[model samples]
Target: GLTATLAALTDDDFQFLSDVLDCRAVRSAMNLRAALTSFQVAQYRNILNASLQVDRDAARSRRLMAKLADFAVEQEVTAGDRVVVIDGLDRMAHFKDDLVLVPLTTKVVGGSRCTICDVVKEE
Candidate 1:
């Protein structure tokens, strides 16, 4: 999705991003563009047919004193700023690395690597 979104954008947008951001970051936007806008998880089903999804459990409340805590991030979490790092940084790094590779690492929009993109190209 990353790569796809970048490629999907107009050339003007890509150039604008390149100027405003560093190589890594500009590439980051491009990377997401190259694959992101149209990217989605596969082999999944969302049940729109369900009802009565109950409230969460382990629903407990507690209080803690900041002076008693030992850290900033730890304090923040308790203070309502929760963070969820879903996937490993290692995996993220692996794909980002692919951005600069020859012949383009990301799936090009209009579907060369994209099955859907390919269909457009074929036409």
Candidate 2:
């Protein structure tokens, strides 16, 4: 056992081993604290990046728009969520400004294939 073996070593050697263990413990605690703090910020990004976008023309099309064929999600999306449209061209449309909060609505295309797409305020 190291306990019995330490008894045979010089006191200086035992002191060095004790210091090394203490240093390791300090480093591990610091690492855990940083990870938890950084993960908090990451959660914020997850929500913000959930914001998304698409070309103004795409949303106007009846057939193509229904499928969201050329859409760009800032990240993953879900129905009933408020999304920020980051597309720069929407400003020219009735929405006026790339930073509009759009509501996501769900629709079923065919055979239970659920899809989520954003709708403009005009209807």
Candidate 3:
């Protein structure tokens, strides 16, 4: 079925379809939007910091806003139903830049026997 679907597409169409199916475009867009939102929120908080001079605070806030704007450009490609896709992608990209792939795992090596863990482990 998948092979038939692939066979029906031109190279460009396939590329677009692949991007959509793999969710990379959607994920990236959502992530960028999320990052922009988060940075905006942070900028708002920093604006309230009285220790900084008005000019310095304004400068920092402007820089963050600029960065947020840059990231916001990607939001158009994200799937409408799932806003977190872009946000998650942005976070993943940041992690990649840091060369950090925080491995996430759960095991019952030493924990007390719990039904949730046991069920997941069995599956």
Candidate 4:
């Protein structure tokens, strides 16, 4: 949600974030950290659901082993200090304004691009 919001702006767009943060470092940090944690949980759940198999004894077992190993590596990657990147603003509907987000970075090349690390419940 905030990703697209921020992405739409360029280096000239820090004003909005500045107003929202209002120099409250501690509060912003805490909110951002919690958001990232929740985002990771959602990511983990999506990954598991995508790879789940309904039935098939032999192949299921084999696939499960492979998927589990891959999941371990992915888990390590997303565990800490990770940021979530959405290619575009397509899924904005899925993330309503009630969801607080931590904007990490933005790029103005071409149209626009942004990196948001977390999506936390509004406080």
lDDT, candidate 2, 27-59, per-residue tens: 111222223344543442332122112222323
Per-model C-alpha lDDT, please? 0.20, 0.27, 0.27, 0.33
Q: Each prediction's TM-score against the native? A: 0.14, 0.16, 0.20, 0.21
Candidates ranked by TM-score: 4, 3, 2, 1
- Give the winner by TM-score: 4
- Write the number of the candidate with greater TM-score, choosing between 2 and 3: 3
Q: Highest lDDT: give the candidate number.
A: 4
Tens digits of per-residue lDDT, candidate 3, 12-111, equal: 3323222222222222233332344566534532432221223234554454334333322343222221221221221222222223221121111111
Q: Mind giving the per-residue lDDT tens digits that candidate 4 earns over 8-116? A: 3332343322221221221113232333445653464343223233223345435443433332132212112323332222132113345544454432322323243
Q: What are the C-alpha RMSDs, in order, of all predicted structures? A: 19.9, 27.1, 20.3, 16.2
Q: Could you tell me how far off, in angstroms, the CA of residue 86 lies in candidate 1 after the best superposition?
A: 23
lDDT of 3: 0.27
Query: What clash pairs does model 4 have?
Result: none
How would you order the candidates by lDDT, starting with the best?
Answer: 4, 3, 2, 1
Residue 50 local lDDT, model 1: 11
